């Protein structure tokens, strides 16, 4: 073969310990750049003027944060949605002040994680598998796009992207609640049903398969030794599992087809999480949670509060306090 | 803002002249030719593959349409669709600048609590722009604001002397029809009380098209991966007697 | 939920954080294992809809553990190789998460919160330029408590005059 | 920063004690027949 041919063969080789592939040629460098910049910024970055009001917020370990408080802080509200690569700054010191590492990181990351998804399709094709693992991964991926790209686009600034940090994540959540009433939004509700239900079904499936493992070991050894990698025979008795679960509830509420069951395990969390991502991505354009504020009124016209009104008071607390020096005019319109 | 920035009907009409000729030339081309060798070797040729390509394309178009209705006020006139999010935020700053200047404020030299101008400040390249959070929206352009713009951005002479009642009205209208509102169409911020039945057509059109574009990307992946597998002959599962991984060397 | 944020700063609590990891970790495991089995299936029928090509009483695995294992080893670096372990882990993770969150809530019964980092507060009290996302979220908490308590806790008969309510500029 | 002075030894032994337990058990497994 010529050089190109040999290179292609190596790139697409099914024999590399980690698959490379064409998606991987973009994934590898972009994820490395995002990782390296994040690590260095998380340890050593100086404070960043996230809200463009010359009030820099310290995200890094060496500037007074611990693992829980630390973050790579979003780029400046003065920048908005302008593209701020290192070479647009007059100096690294300026680049740091304005939150340039955040943009470098989230753009390389979103590109690399999209290539991670393509790479899952690509390897499944090389191995003669069915192709849709990558469609499952599109759910967390879509959620990362929602919080790092679509929400900033809708609101007009990457300063409203989710911070890269534990406390900054909670900050993004509380402010999101104040501004969109996300808890009262049905797509976030489907999200919760997706992850609580994913956890429930994860534990359920775990416990049912575990409950019906066929005896292959003694009591002084792990039952795990009862299964050998690549054996042809199933390692539990599906018929006993269904016999169990169909009686727990009733026969027709239990799956007797493993393909059906596994498809349900894939679909329930993935679809709920697609709705979570879409909740964020549509609240990005300010179509917000249900608003029943003062919905219940008595015969005279007195407001009779409901729990929706109590939520509203908590939300008001968040709204009036957030970014306490950034608003000059009475309405928070983005 | 790529194509979404188109801001005058001469460019819109000219673009469609081009696009109409490109599409007719392209169509004649494809009637008169058969696909070349390099295209033959790059694609999957099946009904399901073609569907996948179109799903990919419609997905892309959906996201673009979302951004077009969110930001563009030329082919989506604010007279008909309501103010854009950037527009309404700028209209708020304009409203209170007019209000407080009528009361006697000197709005060019008024320093806000952070040290930045309360009404007016500079963009990162120096242009004079409204201050407060709408600093992010200084790329906004609209017919009611533009008369106040000079070569260096918002002009303080024009602001002090030339603001007409129709600009005050329009900025007030747009500020109080910002595209924020609940799913049950209660207009305003999420803590606002019931009273105003309003969700901007811009929010309806952006959110619906995002959802549609998103699920179309999913359908693109679903069908593109399926078309590949079907073409290569393993869409129904792995042949137990010819399992490809079993003829591959160990990774370790 | 919002009460626990504003009063207990419950997001900051490492027992709640372990809960979150086991719920989201369990949802992850649920999705990835369902998708993996569905995408490493053996061709066991002629149908393009593949559900009918399974029989409850069949001896043989319906999907290839070996191919699945190779796939994830090469995509992610590691992979399951033991199905008994895999399914045990699916029990362990969300179950363990829930039990951890319960322990944190037992502390909250007593207001024994992870509310604060003392080092953070000592620094911020002396240095009015020092700000982190941790100090920002406490400002949000103080707003939640002041704005919601009078209607949320009616037996206290709270009356908070407008002038005492914590607010930032304009809002 | 005014941290708790015991956090360093608490953290160090929290890692070391169980990590060493595991390494002990691992190595004597490997050394079996």
């Amino acid at each position: 073969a010529n050089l190109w041919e040999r290179f292609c063969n190596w790139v697409t080789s099914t024999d590399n310990r980690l698959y490379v592939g064409w998606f991987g040629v973009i994934m590898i460098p972009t994820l490395l750049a995002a990782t390296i910049c994040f690590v260095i910024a998380f340890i050593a970055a100086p404070p960043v003027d996230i809200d463009g009001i010359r009030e820099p917020v310290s995200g890094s370990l060496l500037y007074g944060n611990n693992i829980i408080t630390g973050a790579v802080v979003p780029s400046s509200n003065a920048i908005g949605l302008h593209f701020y690569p290192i070479w647009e700054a007059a100096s690294l010191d300026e680049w740091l002040y304005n939150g340039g590492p955040y943009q470098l990181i989230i753009f390389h990351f979103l590109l690399g994680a999209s290539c991670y998804m393509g790479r899952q399709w690509e390897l499944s094709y090389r191995l003669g598998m069915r192709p849709w693992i990558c469609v499952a991964y599109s759910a967390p991926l879509a959620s990362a796009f929602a919080v790092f790209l679509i929400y900033p686009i809708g609101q007009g600034s990457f300063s409203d992207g989710m911070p890269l940090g534990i406390s900054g994540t909670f900050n993004f959540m509380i402010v999101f609640q104040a501004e969109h009433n996300i808890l009262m939004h049905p797509f976030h509700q489907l999200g919760v049903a997706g992850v609580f239900g994913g956890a429930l079904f994860c534990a359920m499936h775990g416990s049912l398969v575990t409950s019906s493992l066929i005896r292959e070991t003694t009591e002084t050894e792990s039952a795990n030794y009862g299964y050998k990698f690549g054996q042809e025979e199933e390692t539990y008795n599906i018929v006993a599992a269904h016999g169990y679960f169909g009686r727990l509830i009733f026969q027709y509420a239990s799956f007797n087809n493993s393909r059906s069951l596994h498809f349900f395990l894939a679909a329930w969390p993935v679809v709920g999480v697609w709705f979570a991502a879409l909740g964020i991505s549509t609240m990005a354009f300010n179509l917000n949670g249900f608003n029943f504020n003062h919905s219940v009124i008595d015969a005279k016209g007195n407001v009779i509060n409901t729990w929706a009104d109590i939520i509203n008071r908590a939300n008001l607390g968040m709204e009036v306090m957030h970014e306490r020096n950034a608003h000059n005019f009475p309405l928070d319109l983005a | 803002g790529w194509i979404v920035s188109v801001n005058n009907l001469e460019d819109v009409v000219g673009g469609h002249i081009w696009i109409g000729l490109i599409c007719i030339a392209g169509g004649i081309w494809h009637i008169l030719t058969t696909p070349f060798g390099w295209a033959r070797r790059a694609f999957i040729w099946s009904g399901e593959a073609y569907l996948s390509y179109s799903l990919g394309a419609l997905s892309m178009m959906g996201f673009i349409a979302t951004c077009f209705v969110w930001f563009n006020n030329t082919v989506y006139p604010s007279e008909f669709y309501g103010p854009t999010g950037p527009e309404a935020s700028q209209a708020q700053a304009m409203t209170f600048l007019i209000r407080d200047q009528k009361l006697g404020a000197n709005v060019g030299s008024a320093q806000g609590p952070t040290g930045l101008g309360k009404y007016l400040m500079r963009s990162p390249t120096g242009e004079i722009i409204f201050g407060g959070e709408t600093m992010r929206f200084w790329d906004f352009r609209g017919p009611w604001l533009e008369p106040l713009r000079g070569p260096n951005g918002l002009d303080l002479n024009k602001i002090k002397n030339d603001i007409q009642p129709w600009q005050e009205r329009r900025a007030a209208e747009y500020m109080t029809h910002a595209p924020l509102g609940s799913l049950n169409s209660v207009g305003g911020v999420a803590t606002e009380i019931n009273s105003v039945n309003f969700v901007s057509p811009r929010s309806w059109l952006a959110t619906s098209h995002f959802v549609l574009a998103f699920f179309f990307l999913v359908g693109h992946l679903w069908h593109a991966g399926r078309a590949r597998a079907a073409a290569a002959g393993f869409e129904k599962g792995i042949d137990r007697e010819s399992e490809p991984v079993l003829s591959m060397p160990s990774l370790d | 939920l919002l009460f626990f944020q504003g009063f207990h700063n419950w997001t900051l609590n490492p027992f709640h954080m372990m809960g979150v990891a086991g719920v989201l970790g369990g949802a992850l495991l649920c999705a990835i294992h369902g998708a993996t089995v569905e995408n490493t299936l053996f061709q066991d029928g002629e149908g393009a809809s593949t559900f009918r090509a399974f029989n409850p009483t069949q001896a043989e695995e319906t999907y290839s553990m070996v191919t699945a294992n190779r796939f994830w080893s090469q995509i992610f670096g590691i992979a399951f190789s033991n199905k008994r372990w895999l399914h045990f882990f699916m029990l362990f993770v969300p179950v363990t998460g829930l039990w951890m969150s319960a322990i944190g809530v037992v502390g909250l019964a007593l207001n024994l919160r992870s509310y604060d980092f003392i080092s953070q507060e000592i620094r911020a009290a002396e240095d009015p330029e020092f700000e982190t996302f941790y100090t920002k979220n406490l400002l949000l908490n103080e707003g939640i408590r002041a704005w919601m308590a009078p209607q949320d806790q009616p037996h206290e008969n709270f009356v908070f005059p407008e002038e005492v309510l914590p607010r930032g500029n304009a809002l | 920063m005014e941290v708790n002075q015991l956090g360093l030894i608490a953290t160090a032994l929290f890692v070391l004690v169980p990590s060493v337990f595991l390494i002990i058990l691992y190595v004597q497994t490997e050394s079996q027949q």
């Binding site: 980690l18 | 370790d252 | 080893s73 | 953290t11 160090a12």
Partner: peptide, 30 residues
């Protein structure tokens, strides 16, 4: 000391990833 501790634990976890991947017990059909 605290920063050193955080970075130290992180660097151990990264090393652990390296060994868990490249120096895993190999899966064997048997």
């Amino acid at each position: 000391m605290e920063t050193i501790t955080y970075v130290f634990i992180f660097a151990c976890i990264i090393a652990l990833f390296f060994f868990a991947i490249f120096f895993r017990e190999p899966p064997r059909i048997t």
